[PDB]
Design a protein around this motif. Structure first.
Motif, mmCIF file in Angstrom:
data_model
loop_
_atom_site.group_PDB
_atom_site.id
_atom_site.type_symbol
_atom_site.label_atom_id
_atom_site.label_comp_id
_atom_site.label_asym_id
_atom_site.label_seq_id
_atom_site.Cartn_x
_atom_site.Cartn_y
_atom_site.Cartn_z
ATOM 1 N N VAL A 163 0.830 -1.199 0.009
ATOM 2 C CA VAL A 163 0.077 -0.087 -0.069
ATOM 3 C C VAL A 163 1.094 1.343 -0.150
ATOM 4 O O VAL A 163 0.416 2.445 -0.452
ATOM 5 N N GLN A 164 2.120 1.148 0.483
ATOM 6 C CA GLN A 164 2.746 2.122 0.630
ATOM 7 C C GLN A 164 3.255 2.726 -0.879
ATOM 8 O O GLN A 164 3.140 4.173 -1.290
ATOM 9 N N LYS A 165 3.378 2.080 -1.677
ATOM 10 C CA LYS A 165 3.725 2.420 -3.286
ATOM 11 C C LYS A 165 2.521 3.069 -3.830
ATOM 12 O O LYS A 165 2.699 4.032 -4.469
ATOM 13 N N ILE A 166 1.393 2.495 -3.403
ATOM 14 C CA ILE A 166 0.061 3.096 -4.012
ATOM 15 C C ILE A 166 -0.196 4.499 -3.530
ATOM 16 O O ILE A 166 -0.511 5.467 -4.207
ATOM 17 N N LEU A 167 0.079 4.487 -2.171
ATOM 18 C CA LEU A 167 -0.108 6.043 -1.633
ATOM 19 C C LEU A 167 0.806 6.898 -2.333
ATOM 20 O O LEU A 167 0.316 8.027 -2.715
ATOM 21 N N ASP A 168 2.187 6.636 -2.519
ATOM 22 C CA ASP A 168 2.918 7.509 -3.012
ATOM 23 C C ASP A 168 2.870 7.729 -4.301
ATOM 24 O O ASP A 168 2.711 9.065 -4.880
ATOM 25 N N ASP A 169 2.392 6.658 -5.260
ATOM 26 C CA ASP A 169 1.600 7.134 -6.599
ATOM 27 C C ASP A 169 0.436 8.280 -6.705
ATOM 28 O O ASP A 169 0.466 9.045 -7.375
ATOM 29 N N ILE A 170 -0.379 7.848 -5.755
ATOM 30 C CA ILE A 170 -1.506 8.724 -5.665
ATOM 31 C C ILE A 170 -1.241 10.174 -5.384
ATOM 32 O O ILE A 170 -1.518 10.973 -5.997
ATOM 33 N N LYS A 171 -0.061 10.394 -4.182
ATOM 34 C CA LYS A 171 0.213 11.672 -3.952
ATOM 35 C C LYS A 171 1.058 12.154 -5.233
ATOM 36 O O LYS A 171 0.538 13.477 -5.446
ATOM 37 N N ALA A 172 1.914 11.568 -6.024
ATOM 38 C CA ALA A 172 2.607 12.205 -7.001
ATOM 39 C C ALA A 172 1.855 12.501 -8.038
ATOM 40 O O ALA A 172 1.962 13.296 -9.008
#
Lengths: 50, 50
Positions: free
Chosen positions: B13-22
């Motif tokens: 989930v961390q990479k998904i959240l980072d992608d959403i933020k980006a």
């Protein structure tokens, strides 16, 4: 003499005339499973002792 | 059991959240100096009409 329609001579218009049975089918996205073997899954309680 | 084959994996989930933020830094507009050409002309052998 047997009183059954084993073999008949039919025109091409009567090929699809034998459709009179109501069939019920389940969706592919749902699942069907057998849970009979789950009937014996349990644990026995042990009485307290010295 | 009888059902369609589905692979039950777990993502990070961390990479998904980072992608959403980006994704918030994207822009749906662009800044230009001149508009794109919208009309063009074709010349025949005539020197009066195009």
């Amino acid at each position: 003499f047997i009183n059954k329609r084993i073999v008949e001579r039919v025109r091409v218009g009567q090929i699809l005339a034998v459709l009179n049975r109501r069939f019920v089918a389940y969706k592919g996205k749902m699942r069907i499973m057998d849970i009979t073997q789950s009937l014996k899954m349990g644990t026995k309680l042990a009485a307290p002792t010295v | 059991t009888a059902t369609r084959e589905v692979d039950f994996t777990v993502p990070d989930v961390q990479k998904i959240l980072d992608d959403i933020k980006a994704l918030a830094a994207e822009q749906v507009y662009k800044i230009v100096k001149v508009p794109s050409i919208s009309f063009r002309h074709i010349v025949m052998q005539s020197r009066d009409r195009v």
